[PDB]
Amino acid sequence: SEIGRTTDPVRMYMREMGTVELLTREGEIDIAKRIEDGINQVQCSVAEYPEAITYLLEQYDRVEAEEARLSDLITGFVDIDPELAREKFAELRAQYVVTRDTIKHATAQEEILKLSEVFKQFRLVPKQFDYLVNSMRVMMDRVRTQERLIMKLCVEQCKMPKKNFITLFTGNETSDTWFNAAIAMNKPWSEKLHDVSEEVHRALQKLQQIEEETGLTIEQVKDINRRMSIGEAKARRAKKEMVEANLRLVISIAKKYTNRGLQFLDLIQEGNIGLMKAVDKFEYRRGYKFSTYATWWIRQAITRSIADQARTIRIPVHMIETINKLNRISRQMLQEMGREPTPEELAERMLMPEDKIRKVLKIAKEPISMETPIGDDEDSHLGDFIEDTTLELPLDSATTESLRAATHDVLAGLTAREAKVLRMRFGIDMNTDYTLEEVGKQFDVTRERIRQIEAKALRKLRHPSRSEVLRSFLDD
């Protein structure tokens, strides 16, 4: 056994990946058949709940007047043109209505099963079928969460036996007939929850609407949903066997992308995501091999992840493709001319203007490491030569402080009103500068008078008696 011998996650992955053998042309077909039988079982278990079929026939009468098209409702039929769907929808509606009234109780299990097997014929688009199964999951999980809030409160009270709290709770479904039997033992635990016997009502009386909103029994709903779970675990275990058998295909494709910015296991994992999508989308009834379809999705995922995350500064996919196209045009022009082309002629063989190609050539460059050795030494690196350009020079800070002092000096040599409106008009020793109207309203004076005051104060400061300190803070 090779366990504990290597550190490489590539070797560990290849080691655990090679323990699944490749499928034949026949192995892919019956794995795909297992997937489609799992999904068919999920659908025939969905058919027991009626409102999903009601929503689907709502969708069809919306297709009738074209609020939508049935090309988005069904992908085809198995025993898309819109005339056969009329036949199948009519025969399905004639089944749903003939099931709706027949309620009894042994007779009620003939029509539901034949409607299930006649609803099996519709191979829906994934969106509608997923909507139906998620709708049923929400119905069953809210019903289930009040089902276990029934026991949530029973744990809120005291010690919790529910080994035999389930004895006659099954089947009554209308009232507290099962609830009265709990105090019939008169053990202390059977005390507690009973004084909460009123507060429990709106849980199991909210059942009062839902058993009138679903039509079928609590365990009937729960068990068609557990049959849905069995069907989807069959379809999910069969999808896992098709992904696990085809990981060599992903490595086979991913080895051709190995040095474009992403590492080999990164490419393998992105291609594995593409392969899982391919398994979800594959159709074996087209007669093609799984490799033929799956290569498209694996290559899509790998190239998309290279466009997404191979670069520090991310370039969008449209510019990534412009760069790739420019590069292969440059390769052709370098081969056919023996000389690296200039952007002028590189813009004439391409369809693009020259100023567009110049920025495309300036746009595709990867950052240098600041641990790059300069001089190819190991003592001085590129980061040692890069300067903080946001630092204020200490002579500039000292000039700023001297200028604050000088304007403080000249503003002390003005009237208190003029120095105030001139410290307020500008942001001097305030956090914000003000407009003529704000300075005026603070003084309860007009805008134009404040303009006059500040213009006069500026004219005073223009005189060389008050200006020779400040004129030193100017340049050529």
Partner 1 sequence: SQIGLFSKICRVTIKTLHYYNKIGLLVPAYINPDNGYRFYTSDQLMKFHQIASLRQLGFTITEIVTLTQDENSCHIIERRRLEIQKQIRD
Ligand X SMILES: C[C@H](CCC(=O)NCCC[N+](C)(C)C[C@H](O)CS(=O)(=O)O)[C@H]1CC[C@H]2[C@@H]3[C@H](O)C[C@@H]4C[C@H](O)CC[C@]4(C)[C@H]3C[C@H](O)[C@]12C
Residues that bind ligand X (CB under 6 A): 368, 374, 382, 385
Query: Contact 221/143 with Cβ under 8 angstroms?
Result: yes
Of 218 and 347, CB closest to DNA: 347
Binding partner of residue 66 among ligand X, DNA, partner 1, none, CB cut-off 5 to 8 Å per kind: partner 1
For the bound state, the minimum distance from the C-beta of residue 365 to ligand X, rounded and expressed in Å, comes to 9
For the bound state, the minimum distance from the C-beta of residue 426 to ligand X, rounded and expressed in Å, comes to 39
Binding partner of residue 69 among partner 1, ligand X, DNA, none, CB cut-off 5 to 8 Å per kind: partner 1
- Structural tokens at position 388: 């903080």
Binding partner of residue 436 among partner 1, ligand X, DNA, none, CB cut-off 5 to 8 Å per kind: DNA
Query: Contact 461/410 with Cβ under 8 angstroms?
Result: yes
Burial class (CB in 10 A: 0-12, 13-18, 19+), 386: exposed
Of 58 and 384, CB closest to ligand X: 384
Close Cβ partners of 3 (under 8 Å, ≥ 6 residues apart):
none
Binding partner of residue 18 among partner 1, DNA, ligand X, none, CB cut-off 5 to 8 Å per kind: DNA
What is d(CA 142, CA 133) in angstroms, rounded to the nearest whole number?
Answer: 14
Binding partner of residue 43 among ligand X, DNA, partner 1, none, CB cut-off 5 to 8 Å per kind: none
For the bound state, the minimum distance from the C-beta of residue 73 to DNA, rounded and expressed in Å, comes to 16
Using Cβ positions, the residue closest to ligand X within the complex turns out to be: 385
Of 80 and 108, CB closest to partner 1: 80
- Structural tokens at position 374: 């300069």
Of 111 and 241, CB closest to DNA: 241
Of 131 and 264, CB closest to DNA: 264
Dihedral sign for Cα atoms in the order 344, 350, 354, 358: negative
How many other C-beta atoms can be found within 10 angstroms of the C-beta atom of residue 13?
16
Query: Contact 32/284 with Cβ under 8 angstroms?
Result: yes
For the bound state, the minimum distance from the C-beta of residue 372 to ligand X, rounded and expressed in Å, comes to 7
* Angle at CA of residue 127, ends 37 and 33, nearest 5°: 15
For the bound state, the minimum distance from the C-beta of residue 240 to DNA, rounded and expressed in Å, comes to 15
Binding partner of residue 393 among partner 1, DNA, ligand X, none, CB cut-off 5 to 8 Å per kind: none
What is d(CA 121, CA 41) in angstroms, rounded to the nearest whole number?
Answer: 12
For the bound state, the minimum distance from the C-beta of residue 374 to ligand X, rounded and expressed in Å, comes to 6
Of 82 and 161, CB closest to partner 1: 82
Residues lying near partner 1 in the complex (CB under 8 A): 66, 68-69, 72, 127
For the bound state, the minimum distance from the C-beta of residue 282 to DNA, rounded and expressed in Å, comes to 5
For the bound state, the minimum distance from the C-beta of residue 130 to partner 1, rounded and expressed in Å, comes to 12
For the bound state, the minimum distance from the C-beta of residue 439 to DNA, rounded and expressed in Å, comes to 8
Binding partner of residue 282 among ligand X, partner 1, DNA, none, CB cut-off 5 to 8 Å per kind: DNA
Of 385 and 476, CB closest to ligand X: 385
Binding partner of residue 212 among DNA, partner 1, ligand X, none, CB cut-off 5 to 8 Å per kind: none
Binding partner of residue 127 among partner 1, ligand X, DNA, none, CB cut-off 5 to 8 Å per kind: partner 1
Of 65 and 184, CB closest to partner 1: 65
Of 62 and 381, CB closest to partner 1: 62
